[PDB]
Amino acid sequence: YNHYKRLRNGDTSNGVELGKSNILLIGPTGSGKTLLAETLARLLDVPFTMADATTLTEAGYVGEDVENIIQKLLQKSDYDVQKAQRGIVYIDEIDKISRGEGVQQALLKLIEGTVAAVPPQGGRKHPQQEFLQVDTSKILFICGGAFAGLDKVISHRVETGSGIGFGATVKAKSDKASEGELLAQVEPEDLIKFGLIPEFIGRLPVVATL
Amino acid sequence: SALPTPHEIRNHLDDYVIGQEQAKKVLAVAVYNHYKRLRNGDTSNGVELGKSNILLIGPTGSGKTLLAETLARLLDVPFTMADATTLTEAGYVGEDVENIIQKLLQKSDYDVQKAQRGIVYIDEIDKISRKSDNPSITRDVSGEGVQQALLKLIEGTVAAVPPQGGRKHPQQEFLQVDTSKILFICGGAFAGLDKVISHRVETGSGIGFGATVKSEGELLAQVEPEDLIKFGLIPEFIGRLPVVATLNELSEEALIQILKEPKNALTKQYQALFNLEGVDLEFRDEALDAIAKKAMARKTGARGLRSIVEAALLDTMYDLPSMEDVEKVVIDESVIDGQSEPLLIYG
Amino acid sequence: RGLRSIVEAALLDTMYDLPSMEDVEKVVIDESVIDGQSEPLLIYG
Amino acid sequence: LTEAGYVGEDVENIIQKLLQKSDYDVQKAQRGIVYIDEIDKISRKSDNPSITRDVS
Amino acid sequence: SHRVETGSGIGFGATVKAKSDKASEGELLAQVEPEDLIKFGLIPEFIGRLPVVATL
Amino acid sequence: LVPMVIEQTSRGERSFDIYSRLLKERVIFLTGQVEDHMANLIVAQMLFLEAENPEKDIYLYINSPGGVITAGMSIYDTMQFIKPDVSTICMGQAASMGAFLLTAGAKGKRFCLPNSRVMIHQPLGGYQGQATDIEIHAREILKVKGRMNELMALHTGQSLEQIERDTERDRFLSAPEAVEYGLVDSILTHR
Amino acid sequence: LVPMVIEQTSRGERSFDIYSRLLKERVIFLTGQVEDHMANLIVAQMLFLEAENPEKDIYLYINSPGGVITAGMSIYDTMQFIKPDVSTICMGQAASMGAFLLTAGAKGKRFCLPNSRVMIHQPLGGYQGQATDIEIHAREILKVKGRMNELMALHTGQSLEQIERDTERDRFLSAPEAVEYGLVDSILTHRNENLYF
Ligand SMILES: Nc1ncnc2c1ncn2[C@@H]1O[C@H](COP(=O)(O)OP(=O)(O)OP(O)(O)=S)[C@@H](O)[C@H]1O
Ligand SMILES: Nc1ncnc2c1ncn2[C@@H]1O[C@H](COP(=O)(O)OP(=O)(O)O)[C@@H](O)[C@H]1O
Ligand SMILES: [Mg+2]
């Protein structure tokens, strides 16, 4: 609502620029991450595309790969720059790239906002200038992925730094209720230990946990 | 058509940046000189003005990337921002160093004559430094291989740029761009440089009896080229970058200023969001101090601030549109902690 | 190339405030300026 | 420059630049001068066996 | 194989697996999931458009 | 031999010794006779754990037939000096010094296994020399015995007189007996 | 067997020994009998720490029944030589040499644990041979006793006569007795109620 409310008032005459807030979705597999993004796109008639970070982990010509995402959105958007700029982008398996620092650096530039050149309506050959210039600053990006190791990290911090002794609470029966409450307490510090980049976390202030 | 003085440029930077005086002076002086060197394109005299490139050094969340963005707002000439981590040695599939100029052309509507007069900010330059060198007899692609390529680019040479989103190949569809007049601002958050500086300043003689025994921003302000050589930068690269500007770390007081003093301050952004919705938002001074401590405790710097505010006002922002007859919202220190909810005034 | 760095640092402050300054016709750089003990001498005319 | 088949560039490109200066007058280029800077950047890393080919 | 095989143990009680129990492509393609196809080089969205997976 | 153990971190798999892996989880072992070197090692582990995170509880496992007193007191003083609560667990047995350290743990964090066996007795000593030095050394061991009994009574909550009567000779106690004596808070029968 | 610990540095994780990790925090341990080798090791550590940071205080924990004197003098001289204030702490016990080193710490930075016990006595020695050599060795140990007593009086602030009377035979002292005798400055009963550091 907030992201689109800003687009509704693009000018917002004041001495204030409304910075975009992206979302980070944490949860297990099949918990409904992609469905939430898709359902929003159905509710709000905007183009929705889906990308996978693992495919992009190659770290070769990342600019072309990240730009392709935008190109995919334009096809669904019917090559409408205005409609495409309002689109929703969902990125999956963002945890896998963490340890690919170069991948994160390329991604955050796309998340922060940049101008991308996409060839118009395909074509055999077209001049540089003809390429459409779309801005990613106005596009909402949702990053998802399951962080299995992260749960243990939170426990090591929030709870006693144990897990091997007698007193250690390892009464784990795969209930997953403890894991859900523990992930709710997720903070940027926990993601840092998992391998994410602080710059990337700062561009994903909103953290939703399934 | 008088050019803006550095004082004017610094005033513009102050609107968005807080706490970096030396870096602001350097950038303002560099930009002013840049405009002067371009104005006298003919330069009818026996002198050719040579550019002085900048080198920004500062911890994360200090304002390096932000300073670059602010210049773009007040820069007539094309400004582009690039990342050095992608860049790879020619012949390798990662990326090439000519892509930078390509982005610059896009900002100038592919007007070569307008790009040569541009400014380029290269981020994450420290990543290229040989930190854990472990000699590269096989190859050094992400590090020393990139510095070597940039040398002529910074110094000034014609660069073959593909038309758009292409890589170099036998194809002759290349337009030549000259970087002799392009200004480069290489910014990197050098990690461990302070230790190198301290070693030089506190080298001492030995450890025995006969031997003699001897702030981050203040320590970094004593940076010399030799400190950078040991960090993994070729002497040639520093020569290309004469100027050096240090950025001190953000204190708790600075974070409080960042919340309200800037033109695009976090507090002002949310107030505008509520104001267009018909509601008034007020942040108490205690709340701002509380937010700064939370960010400092989490070691998230200024970036963390957006998250603290979003979480605090999540419940309020959810119920506010449906809520009616609500004219003002007040945030207290307790709200940031989560013990209490923000106070609402009904009219 | 080192020379460019030294000259830039010594005149960094002067270049910043020179356009704001008025009635300044000459700037003199002494040996002390390089060391940092003193500041450039400005002549007003 | 690269090793005749890789993405970077071709050595012949040099001559192309030379022709540009001579307005594509071959006879005027064949007698030209060329300066190859950063020639130390292309060198084996003190390795005679050359385990892998150095394209750059 | 990597996804669904955890290897074998070493003790007495552990179940040692020989080459004959390698579980090759025959009877191993039914367990396939979209994640395996993506690693093979297909697009995730492409798989979603083809829900039916007839295995021979 | 000490078997190595791999710990799966975020990216870098780390090889650890079986005893170092547990130390990373705030677990210390006190095995064998109590001497100065092993005691110094335990003290170093306590100090290191305190520096890392002083608000997390520490665990000390005890299987020892006892030993010198000075070393045991150093361990005891360190546990009462640091901020982290030192949870003592008895495995196998805990003699005089082991028991003094066992009962010295944080209140409510002293455990013992069901088949464990605790033993308490008066200090031991001796001297050979002139009568003057003998009289001096006798007072010292006597002062130590009185001091030890006071501390034993303070942690168990029993009467100093009762402790003195029970320490005149070797006294054995099972896990249930220790629970009713105030030595150990609770027994860990199962998980 | 000494456990190995991991330290998270800027470059990455690094493995260190427990005794070395503590040394990184300016902490030295003097355990067991005082000999030349262990004393030489302590000397090396003190010098290394002084060069690292000559302003910060060095903590030295002492749990030993004493030993050779010469080895102790080397450690003592090293402590009085370096600029850093060597904070001495008593764990378990401190015999003649241990006590001499304990009281030799920096003024106001000498601590003892509540249940520690210090012991002081005159030097021990002996020789076998001709009467001439016996007299020589006797005078030397006597000079050592005089020098040791003088230093003990200087640090504790007591009178040389009082020290001589108390060192003629084994004298035991607890933490409170040491404080009133001048061997130690204060006691360390806890970390979060004294904050002497
Ligand atoms: N001096 C400052 N004034 C105002 N806002 C600041 C300042 N420093 C940091 N910030 C805030 O922190 C955010 C991130 O700061 P950046 O300067 O972009 O980080 P950085 O300097 O690029 O460090 P890197 O690029 O991650 S190594 C900005 O978007 C601002 O909101
Ligand atoms: N809460 C839910 N309600 C309805 N369907 C769900 C829900 N959660 C998951 N699904 C089903 O799971 C699929 C999407 O799973 P998803 O969350 O995208 O997995 P992952 O998070 O691993 O990508 C959809 O086909 C959808 O039908
Ligand atoms: Mg940066």
Author numbering:
A (entry chain F): 93 to 191, 204 to 314
B (entry chain E): 62 to 275, 282 to 414
C (entry chain D): 370 to 414
D (entry chain D): 148 to 203
E (entry chain A): 259 to 314
F (entry chain N): 2 to 192
G (entry chain M): 2 to 198
Kindly provide excerpts from the paper associated with this entry:
ClpXP and related AAA+ proteases maintain cellular health by degrading incomplete, damaged, or unneeded proteins in a process that must be specific to avoid destruction of essential intracellular proteins. Escherichia coli ClpXP, for example, degrades proteins bearing a C-terminal degron called the ssrA tag that is added during tmRNA-rescue of stalled ribosomes. The ssrA tag initially binds in the axial channel of the hexameric AAA+ ClpX ring, where the pore-1, pore-2, and RKH loops contribute to recognition. Subsequent mechanical reactions requiring ATP hydrolysis unfold adjacent regions of native protein structure and then translocate the denatured polypeptide through the channel and into the degradation chamber of the double-ring ClpP14 peptidase for proteolysis.
The ssrA degron bound in the top of the ClpX channel in a structure we call the recognition complex and moved ~25 Å or six residues deeper into the channel in a structure we call the intermediate complex. The ssrA degron bound high in the axial channel of the recognition complex, where it was contacted by the RKH, pore-1, and pore-2 loops of ClpX. Importantly, access to the lower channel in this recognition complex was blocked by a previously unvisualized conformation of the pore-2 loop of ClpX subunit A. Thr199 and Val202 side chains from the blocking pore-2 loop in the recognition complex made van der Waals and hydrophobic interactions with the Cβ methyl of the C-terminal alanine of the ssrA degron, and the side chain –OH of the same Thr199 side chain as well as the peptide –NH of Val154 in the pore-1 loop of chain B made hydrogen bonds with the α-coo– of the ssrA degron. Tyr153 and Val154 side-chain or main-chain groups from pore-1 loops (subunits A/B) or Arg228 and His230 side chains from RKH loops (subunits B/C/D/F) made additional contacts with the Ala-Ala-coo– or neighboring degron regions. For example, all previous structures have open channels, whereas the axial channel of the AAA+ ring of ClpX in the recognition complex is closed by the pore-2 loop of subunit A, which makes specific contacts with the C-terminal residue of the ssrA tag. Moreover, only the pore-1 loops of the top two subunits in the ClpX spiral contact the substrate degron in the recognition complex, as opposed to contacts between five pore-1 loops and substrates in other known structures. Subunits ABCDE of ClpX contained ATP/ATPγS and subunit F contained ADP in the recognition complex, whereas subunit A was nucleotide free and the remaining subunits were ATP/ATPγS bound in the intermediate complex. Thus, it is plausible that ATP hydrolysis in subunit A of the recognition complex drives an unfolding power stroke and conversion to the intermediate complex.
